[PDB]
């Protein structure tokens, strides 16, 4: 009515893609920027992804000043496996095992099922996405 057109497309960093989102009554979790950006050589190197994940966790541990606890969804893709495919990259395993140990990226990390993290997360609700 007053010719306002939403929000400009801005890249959501780790901070934005660490809260859980309530979109149309179903919870949506979003992987970080560095995972879906597989258009340059950086994504092919699994060590790079480890390093990007470490940088994201270090940024999160320091810059999260939000109600809730941030939640990084880290899916292990087929490109994250080794050459044979029956084993996972060493770097990616090592990173995941360190996260399971509570520390990775200068940050204390709790790993667990995403269902457990609903009650202690920044479950923001996107009411503008409801139909009507």
């Amino acid at each position: 009515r007053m010719k306002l057109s939403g929000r400009p497309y801005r890249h959501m960093g780790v901070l934005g893609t660490s809260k859980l989102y309530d979109i149309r009554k179903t919870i949506f979790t979003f992987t970080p920027q560095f995972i879906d950006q597989q258009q340059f050589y950086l994504a092919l190197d699994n060590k790079m992804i480890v390093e990007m994940l470490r940088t994201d966790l270090s940024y999160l541990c320091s810059r999260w000043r939000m109600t809730g606890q941030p939640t990084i969804t880290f899916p292990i893709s087929h490109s994250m496996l080794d050459e044979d495919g029956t084993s996972l990259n060493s770097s990616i395993l090592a990173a995941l095992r360190k996260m399971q140990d509570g520390y990775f990226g200068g940050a204390r990390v709790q790993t667990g099922k995403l269902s457990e993290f609903l009650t202690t997360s920044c479950c923001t609700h996107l009411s503008f996405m409801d139909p009507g």
Binding site: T67, G68, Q69, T119, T120, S121, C122, C123
Partner: protein, 528 residues
């Protein structure tokens, strides 16, 4: 009182399933009942079982000035009440109340039906002024004929007016009913306070009806999560709940209910008439759900559910979460005042300790979602919740005798075994200092409560213990197993130290207000 009237409502009392005294209540002057189905259930029984040609029987089996009643004996003896069945005196006044009820309730044919019934029974004084006889009694010679075919005999008036006897209450009701019926006074005029609320208007009347109306009840209680310490607010925020410490709400003062009970103790205090003030009882969930202006400051009170207690029930967080749900459901069912109720969920650092954290966070999270128990809630900052709300201004406090205003303390930020091996019976037959012996060899806080509880009896309140007065060691074991969640000890401890809760008495009244009777006592043992 609303709960009691409702529990007892189609009826009058244990004894009377209907009385015509219900007619003065259900309708003029009180217009008390707020349920249209109970009003009809109550009126219909009163009219059906109590109406007569000459008036309404006060109650069935009534012996007032009946021919069979003994004048000398004040008290009817058992089974006498049968002799008065069909002989019951019929009071013409109840016809006048039914005419006033009809004018109020818009039935222009209940006024006529009962006017027509009263014109015959109405005597007139020598000057023509109408006399409403108090009662119409069956004459003694005709008692058996009425009992045989009730409604057949002719009953003599009690006062004819020419006699010099007038029922002054009935004379007054004739004036009220005749004026109301003749439209020389209006229902609004004689009910300035609107006791009669027509159905279409049963919406926003305080203490009776809420915006939603007479039938709908989805109240949204205005929750405010208040945290004992900044530490707990920062801890709760990390886990998802924004709470506000008592200081963050600076102008607003959060008071224990007991501090309002202290303030109210100064209401109605007259030393000239020897009056003292509100009795010192607990304010409850419908009075701690109000915002109060006491001595120039805004006071919101934490519910009595959050009041610390000696009883061991307080330790179970699941019971606190349930008392929070139970209180909010009471506030929903029974709060009919103008503002949204304000429930303040005080969170204490003890409440989140250990695995109590997971249960408390789910309650706190549901309070954030907007529903806990079917009761919709709006958690928000107290300043926003208290903003345009109605505040009860407690102006009775004044300065009074003392030239100082009373001193009111407000919640402040707290700135930083498988089975008892020792059985009671085999260890109580012993009087030995040996119970004091096992006391040193019992790690069970249940064996200790059983061993250090045999001795609160046989040796005494202060028989010296290694630890100290026995009274102190059971209170240490009760408190210790209360935290370690060792519930056999907490119950042997509470019992041995004879612990009773403040709420046993307030709850035993729920049983009584609801028409139930509680018996305490074991199964197979003395009940009361």
């Amino acid at each position: 009182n609303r709960q009691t009237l409702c529990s007892l409502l189609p009826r009058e009392s244990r004894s009377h399933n209907t009385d015509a005294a219900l007619l003065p209540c259900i309708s003029y002057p009180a217009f008390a009942l707020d349920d249209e189905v109970l009003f009809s259930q109550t009126l219909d029984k009163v009219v059906r079982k109590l109406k007569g040609k000459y008036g309404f029987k006060r109650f069935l089996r009534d012996g007032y000035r009946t021919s069979l009643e003994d004048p000398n004996r004040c008290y009817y003896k058992p089974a006498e009440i049968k002799l008065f069945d069909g002989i019951e005196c019929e009071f013409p006044i109840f016809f006048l109340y039914m005419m006033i009820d009809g004018v109020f309730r818009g039935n222009p044919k209940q006024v006529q039906e009962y006017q027509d019934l009263l014109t015959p029974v109405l005597h007139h004084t020598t000057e023509g002024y109408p006399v409403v006889p108090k009662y119409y009694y069956v004459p003694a010679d005709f008692v058996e004929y009425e009992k045989n075919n009730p409604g057949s005999q002719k009953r003599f008036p009690s006062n004819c007016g020419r006699d010099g006897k007038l029922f002054l209450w009935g004379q007054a009701l004739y004036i009220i009913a005749k004026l109301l019926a003749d439209e020389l006074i209006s229902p609004k005029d004689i009910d300035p306070v609107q006791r009669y609320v027509p159905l279409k208007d049963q919406r926003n009347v305080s203490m009776r009806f809420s915006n939603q109306g007479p039938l709908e009840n989805d109240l949204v209680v205005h929750v405010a999560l208040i945290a004992e310490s900044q530490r707990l607010q920062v801890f709760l925020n990390t886990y998802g709940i924004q709470t506000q410490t008592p200081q963050q709400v600076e102008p607003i003062q959060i008071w224990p209910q007991q501090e309002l009970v202290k303030a109210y103790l100064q209401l109605g205090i007259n030393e000239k008439l020897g009056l003292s003030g509100r009795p010192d009882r607990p304010i409850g969930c419908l009075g701690t759900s109000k915002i109060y202006r006491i001595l120039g400051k805004t006071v919101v009170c934490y519910p009595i559910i959050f009041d610390l207690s000696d009883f061991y029930m307080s330790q179970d967080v699941f019971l606190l979460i349930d008392d929070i749900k139970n209180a909010l459901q009471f506030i929903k069912q029974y709060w009919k005042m103008h503002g949204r109720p304000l429930f303040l969920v005080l969170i204490r650092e003890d409440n989140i300790r250990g695995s109590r954290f997971n249960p408390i966070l789910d309650m706190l999270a549901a309070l954030k979602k907007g529903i806990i128990g079917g009761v919709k809630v709006h958690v928000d900052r107290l300043q926003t919740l208290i903003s345009g709300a109605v505040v009860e201004q407690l102006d009775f406090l004044r300065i009074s005798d003392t030239e100082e205003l009373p001193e009111f303390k407000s919640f402040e930020e707290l700135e930083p075994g498988q089975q008892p091996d020792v059985n009671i019976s085999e260890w109580k037959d012993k009087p030995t200092h040996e119970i004091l012996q096992k006391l040193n060899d019992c790690s069970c806080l249940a064996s200790q409560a059983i061993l250090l509880g045999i001795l609160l009896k046989r040796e005494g309140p202060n028989f010296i213990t290694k630890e100290g007065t026995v009274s102190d060691h059971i209170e240490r074991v009760y408190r210790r197993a209360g935290s370690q969640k060792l519930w056999l000890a907490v119950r042997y401890g509470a019992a041995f130290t004879q612990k009773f809760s403040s709420s046993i008495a307030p709850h035993i009244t729920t049983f009584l207000v609801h028409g139930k009777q509680v018996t305490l006592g074991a199964f197979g043992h003395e009940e009361e």
